[PDB]
Amino acid sequence: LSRLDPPEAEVQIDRLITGRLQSLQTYVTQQLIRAAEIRASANLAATKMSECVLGQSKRVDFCGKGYHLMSFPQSAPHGVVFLHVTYVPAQEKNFTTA
Amino acid sequence: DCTMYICGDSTECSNLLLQYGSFCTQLKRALTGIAVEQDKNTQEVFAQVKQIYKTPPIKYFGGFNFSQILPDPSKPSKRSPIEDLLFNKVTLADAGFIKQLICAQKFNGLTVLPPLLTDEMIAQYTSALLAGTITSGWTFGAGPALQIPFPMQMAYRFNGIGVTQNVLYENQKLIANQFNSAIGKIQDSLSSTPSALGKLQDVVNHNAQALNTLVKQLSSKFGAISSVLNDILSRLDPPEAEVQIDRLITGRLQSLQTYVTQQLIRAAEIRASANLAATKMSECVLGQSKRVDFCGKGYHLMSFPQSAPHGVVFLHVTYVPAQEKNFTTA
Amino acid sequence: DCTMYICGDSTECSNLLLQYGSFCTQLKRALTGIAVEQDKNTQEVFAQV
Amino acid sequence: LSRLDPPEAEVQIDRLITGRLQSLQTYVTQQLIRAAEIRASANLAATKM
Amino acid sequence: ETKCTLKSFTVEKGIYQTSNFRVQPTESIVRFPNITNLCPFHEVFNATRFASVYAWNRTRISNCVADYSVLYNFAPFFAFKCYGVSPTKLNDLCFTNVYADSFVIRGNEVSQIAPGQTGNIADYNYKLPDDFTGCVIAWNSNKLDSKVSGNYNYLYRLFRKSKLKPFERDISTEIYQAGNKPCNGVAGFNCYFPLQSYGFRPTYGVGHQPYRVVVLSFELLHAPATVCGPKKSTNLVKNKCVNFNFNGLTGTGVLTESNKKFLPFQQFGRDIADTTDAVRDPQTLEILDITPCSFGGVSVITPGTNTSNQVAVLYQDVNCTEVPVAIHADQLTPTWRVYSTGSNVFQTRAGCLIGAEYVNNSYECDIPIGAGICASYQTQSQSIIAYTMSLGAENSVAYSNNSIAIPTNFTISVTTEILPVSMTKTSV
Amino acid sequence: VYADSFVIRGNEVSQIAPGQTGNIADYNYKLPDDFTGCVIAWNSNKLDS
Amino acid sequence: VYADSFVIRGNEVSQIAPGQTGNIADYNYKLPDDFTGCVIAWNSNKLDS
Amino acid sequence: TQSYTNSFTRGVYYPDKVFRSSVLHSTQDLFLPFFSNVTWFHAIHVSGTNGTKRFDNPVLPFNDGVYFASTEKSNIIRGWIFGTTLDSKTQSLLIVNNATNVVIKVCEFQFCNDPFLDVSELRVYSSANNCTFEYVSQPFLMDLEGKQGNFKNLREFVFKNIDGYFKIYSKHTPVNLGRDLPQGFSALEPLVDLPIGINITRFQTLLALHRSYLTPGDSSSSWTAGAAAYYVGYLQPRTFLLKYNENGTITDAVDCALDPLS
Ligand SMILES: *[C@@H]1O[C@H](CO)[C@@H](O[C@@H]2O[C@H](CO)[C@@H](O)[C@H](O)[C@H]2NC(C)=O)[C@H](O)[C@H]1NC(C)=O
Ligand SMILES: *[C@@H]1O[C@H](CO)[C@@H](O[C@@H]2O[C@H](CO)[C@@H](O)[C@H](O)[C@H]2NC(C)=O)[C@H](O)[C@H]1NC(C)=O
Ligand SMILES: *[C@@H]1O[C@H](CO)[C@@H](O[C@@H]2O[C@H](CO)[C@@H](O)[C@H](O)[C@H]2NC(C)=O)[C@H](O)[C@H]1NC(C)=O
Ligand SMILES: *[C@@H]1O[C@H](CO)[C@@H](O[C@@H]2O[C@H](CO)[C@@H](O)[C@H](O)[C@H]2NC(C)=O)[C@H](O)[C@H]1NC(C)=O
Ligand SMILES: *[C@@H]1O[C@H](CO)[C@@H](O[C@@H]2O[C@H](CO)[C@@H](O)[C@H](O)[C@H]2NC(C)=O)[C@H](O)[C@H]1NC(C)=O
Ligand SMILES: *[C@@H]1O[C@H](CO)[C@@H](O)[C@H](O)[C@H]1NC(C)=O
Ligand SMILES: *[C@@H]1O[C@H](CO)[C@@H](O)[C@H](O)[C@H]1NC(C)=O
Ligand SMILES: *[C@@H]1O[C@H](CO)[C@@H](O)[C@H](O)[C@H]1NC(C)=O
Ligand SMILES: *[C@@H]1O[C@H](CO)[C@@H](O)[C@H](O)[C@H]1NC(C)=O
Ligand SMILES: *[C@@H]1O[C@H](CO)[C@@H](O)[C@H](O)[C@H]1NC(C)=O
Ligand SMILES: *[C@@H]1O[C@H](CO)[C@@H](O)[C@H](O)[C@H]1NC(C)=O
Ligand SMILES: *[C@@H]1O[C@H](CO)[C@@H](O)[C@H](O)[C@H]1NC(C)=O
């Protein structure tokens, strides 16, 4: 705007402005998809809290590996960390059954 | 690769695109994220086991016949008859096997990176967890595999849904015959159906059509005299060519933006489906599921997953109360 | 429909847009997919019986 | 098209058309994400049923 | 190259894509048709009886080498503005056929002849189509086309029943009806002669002096090209990457004798990418197939930068038995090619690998590659090794119809599930 | 419709335009950027000499 | 700031420009495509005759 | 005489000079719509010597080109006339062939009929006044004989004048056995292209009147039947989707403006 003159400065500004606007559109479009992913993960974490934290979960390999006992969530920056307490049958012995 | 797809081996057009900023390093990062995300999806769905189990040399399960789902050594790919049927059903388009005509046409930088898990070790994962679920039941989904007889495991599964062991131990021959008949007719249904693997076929075809549309977008004048950079640079003059080429480029870049934007959403959907399939494996395959109408219709007994092109196919074994009789209750 | 929404009943503008390539057949396909997807959503949620 | 002459009418039309086409692109891109969310909610509702 | 393609001095474990590799052309081959008879342009430009605008004279140009640089001394060249084809490198183009239309007009209408121009002449005497390719030459001819009494040798139409389509002539001597009043050759009132006097006087100022105009129409649409510039034809080379310039169509790629069946009227070919796939050699009438250089992606497999400075380059989807090994200075764009391409060669379904050797052992794989192959850093004494990914610890169970395994003790284990629930809210 | 007529020098015949800055275009006759209409210019050396 | 002064013919007064090809613009005085600055041209027939 | 018929599927040429294979490329141009009306025309001339006079020649409109098809023994139909307003008020075309020659002119020809006193010249124009363009060279039509009349040759011509470059798309299909325009599909390729500069809306043809045969006479009109052995069809701007064979030819093409399925 100090170098050019309005007649051709307009179209130059228009070209810059549409380019920058499309650049911002790209960021917003990526943010929408990332927020959809984060909402999917947050719904998963909410179901995980409701099931594992507030009771025993009979779902296998959902609240940790092995048979589930309980869980303790911990606050984390921009997330949550669960401490699944699980029962693992550990060492075993063979037998004869009928 | 933006450079090739946008300005085919043209130095002036590469210089013209370089000024656009970090507008394609981000594009490369997005697609690299999609690729590593696909690899993570496959590994999370299938690699639920830490150890690879092998089926016993003899195949007796109390009349139960797993021939159609257990791998056969006669075939050279080590896949089950139903697993191989799934592969035959899905007409795969490209897999990146050093091709050096539609795929061969793509001298436009549109390459398909082969998946990390080749379909000879995904079948190994499926066979391993099949051995786990047919020789140890759900016990291998918690800790070490606990070797238990198959009739015992089936009676335990019946006890899971309130039927008690006596029913299975009094009807074992009938249950084995019914299971064998169902396993026999599921292959016939898959073979003779018009299109059952519709989801996998659509998954392949959507990517194929997206790549085809990207290729076809290379001729849109977008307001230019021609869509060929070589002819533009032989015909016009650098200053006039500058805007003309740039106009064609911004159009092509927007076309590629559309492709990557659609691919991001499609990959989010595929990741949602892969998470669903992983939960399905962890619940139905590695134990009985009390969730109703989750692992098939009817009361669930167990499931067998089968290696499939760009997907997984479960064989949910379900208990259906069949014919009934009225009574008087108090 | 790209033709009507983009060039209202103008022959020269339709000719100009036709050069843009398969840039709106894809647009039609996306929205047709969305429509059939909504129908599938409703039928999958309710027609469990 | 009543005021300008084809030479400059075309480039003017081209500018308007690319702007309107990108505006429609924005709508379709947002609709795709919204439909993905609605499908996630519909899958949740189907499992809930 | 990795440290440059990702702006960081530190690179951790992983496989990064950097750029591609293209076989550079060895020489440039030109195959402009072997013509020498210079087509007559002087007779068109420097004439004494330039036709009137209403009956523009159209001249055809046939097989010739036309140099659009010896015409600069033929006319004053007041304005040499040109359309899509630019006159700068206009001598490097091959035309299917070239047409020159010559006439004379007034000064204020010298810019009136153009695509989509509406007025008297551009609508009733000579209309150029919007898609017209070619350009118009205009120069003042006041010194020659001046008459003290009157230059009553030029004509132009004023009245027509409707508009005029582009590139035709309405040379006709009839009587304009100009209303429901009927006239029969009378040319009386209400019925005016369409051609009226176009006299010129030297005393007239700018914008009214005669402007002899010749407009050249081109049809460079991909088709058998005849009229071509003065570019020397070179020898033809096959099975080697070159910069072909066939009839003004440039590009880069390897040329093979093709099995195409171009019909006698066909010159160029097209695949489903809307780019040229096959071409016809105009000096030989032999069909050539155009396939680009043996390109491919390049992925750099490296451990953490503070673990070693040794990387393993893997080329995407290309056998290391042809181009990856083929390398020379200014022959491939990646100049980092100091990699031997003969030591540590790992052929992979994802394209061959350079810099890593195959290990029969299988471990958990750190840096993914594809097709069940991952490279990792191993102590031999340190080098990058590419192996087949280990699926897991091999295990067998002891299934028995009467045997059962049952645990006698348990282990309580606590795991972590890191689940993001929110991102950084922002506003722009 | 409004017609404004005057006389200027040759080097400044193109100076009368939207957003042009100089001597006349800034101090004697300035046309706005959004100005719609157009300027007619011809030499009058034969009369105004 | 740099000023380059010379004399050329009328048909080639527009030939000196970024990316123009011909006799003078290619063999005697070529201006780069990224050239910033501008060219002043006026007829000198009365003196150089 | 005159009669009508159904064009079925026919009159598809190569719009461009680009080679394609297994490509479903579509393009819009002056194409003959499938299943359209094609009008026969006949020049009855068996009693011309016994007074009577032919009296059978209309002025066929040319609007947006003309599709041509005929079956002549050797050279019964030689040339065409284009232009408008007939008289020297406006120009006209004189496409006419002989042996291995073609001569076409854009000269203001005033005439009344279409004879040439041959089986020479003249009788088809009387004004070589202000002629503009002239052309010579190899004729459009190369005769081939199967040693019998059963293999009736079909000469499919499509004429276009979009900005000059006259279209002479032609092909020979001697597989005909008697049926008028047999069911099937054929491609069509150009021979020559040259601008003429003229507003053309009139079309006529040349017949070897000095020796004619097999010209029955009747009052057939308004969608009736009559042997004419000479076809004329009009083109209209239509979008066509063309399938290119793996070899490179055209196997089948579908219209885009005829049926909802198309
Ligand atoms: C047009 O062609 C004629 C040839 O017919 C040339 O005339 C020459 O003009 C120059 C310039 O005045 C004279 O010095 C020569 O003596 C002329 N030669 C002849 C043979 O007449 C020239 O190429 C063109 N002339 C004009 C006036 O444009
Ligand atoms: C229109 O203009 C040209 C140039 O004035 C006319 O001149 C003759 O063109 C023919 C080519 O058709 C040449 O063979 C002659 O040598 C030219 N000169 C003379 C005196 O005949 C001609 O009338 C027109 N050209 C066309 C129609 O091509
Ligand atoms: C070709 O010439 C004929 C001459 O008759 C034109 O026909 C006339 O066109 C005008 C303008 O549309 C109208 O008066 C009538 O349509 C016709 N007049 C008569 C008396 O029939 C015809 O339009 C010309 N073709 C083109 C494309 O302009
Ligand atoms: C076809 O007919 C044309 C006239 O319709 C004739 O053209 C003659 O061609 C010969 C070839 O050398 C010339 O010598 C004559 O001058 C041409 N005649 C005329 C009137 O132009 C001829 O009968 C045939 N054309 C040929 C043989 O080229
Ligand atoms: C068409 O040809 C005729 C043939 O005589 C031309 O008629 C005369 O041509 C002279 C040329 O010097 C004119 O001075 C006369 O006025 C014409 N008489 C008329 C038109 O009755 C006629 O000029 C030619 N037409 C064209 C457009 O060239
Ligand atoms: C790549 O190498 C393998 C092994 O020699 C060979 O079978 C294959 O054909 C090669 N690729 C191509 C495209 O020829
Ligand atoms: C010249 O080109 C022609 C084809 O147009 C053909 O005779 C041959 O290729 C060349 N002949 C000579 C003598 O150069
Ligand atoms: C890199 O590794 C070296 C040794 O392995 C260590 O001393 C150094 O702190 C590391 N630096 C970073 C940034 O990790
Ligand atoms: C790997 O295995 C085969 C033979 O067992 C062969 O390629 C090679 O000898 C082996 N390499 C090593 C290092 O053992
Ligand atoms: C189970 O019984 C079958 C049939 O007798 C036999 O082949 C198989 O070895 C038995 N398995 C074991 C280890 O008890
Ligand atoms: C052809 O025209 C005749 C009369 O002109 C009409 O009866 C008939 O229906 C038409 N057929 C077609 C297919 O247009
Ligand atoms: C198509 O090409 C094949 C092989 O080139 C050939 O055998 C066949 O006859 C061709 N078909 C034609 C020319 O119709």
Numbering used by the authors:
A (entry chain B): 981 to 1078
B (entry chain C): 737 to 836, 849 to 1078
C (entry chain A): 737 to 785
D (entry chain A): 981 to 1029
E (entry chain B): 298 to 677, 689 to 736
F (entry chain C), G (entry chain A): 395 to 443
H (entry chain C): 25 to 143, 155 to 297
Q: What text does the study give?
A:
To further verify the role of N354 glycosylation in modulating RBD up/down disposition, four additional modified constructs, BA.2.86-T356K, predicted to remove glycosylation at N354, XBB.1.5-K356T and BA.2.75-K356T, predicted to acquire N354 glycan, together with BA.2.86-ins483V as a control, were characterized, and their structural features were compared with the ancestral strain. Thus, we performed all assays under the same condition by using three representative variants (BA.2.86, BA.2.75, and XBB.1.5) with strict controls (loss and gain of N354 glycan). We observed that N354 glycosylation dramatically increased the proportion of the ‘closed’ form from 19% to 79% in BA.2.86, 50% to 75% in BA.2.75, and 45% to 90% in XBB.1.5, making the ‘closed’ form the dominant population. Notably, the N354 glycan resides in a cleft formed by the NTD and RBD from two neighboring subunits, and establishes hydrogen bonds with T167 of NTD and with E340 of RBD, respectively, acting like a ‘bolt’ to lock the S-trimer in an ‘RBD-down’ state. For this, three paired groups of six variants (BA.2.75/BA.2.75.5; XBB.1.5/XBB.1.5.44; BA.2.86/BA.2.86-T356K) were carefully selected due to the only difference being the presence of N354 glycosylation or not in their RBDs. Surface plasmon resonance (SPR) results demonstrated that RBDs with or without the N354 glycosylation showed comparable binding affinities to hACE2, indicating that the N354 glycosylation does not impact hACE2 binding. Coincidentally, the N354 glycosylation (K356T mutation) first emerged in BA.2.75.5 and then in XBB.1.5.44, but they did not display growth advantages compared to the prevalent variants, presumably due to the dramatically reduced infectivity.
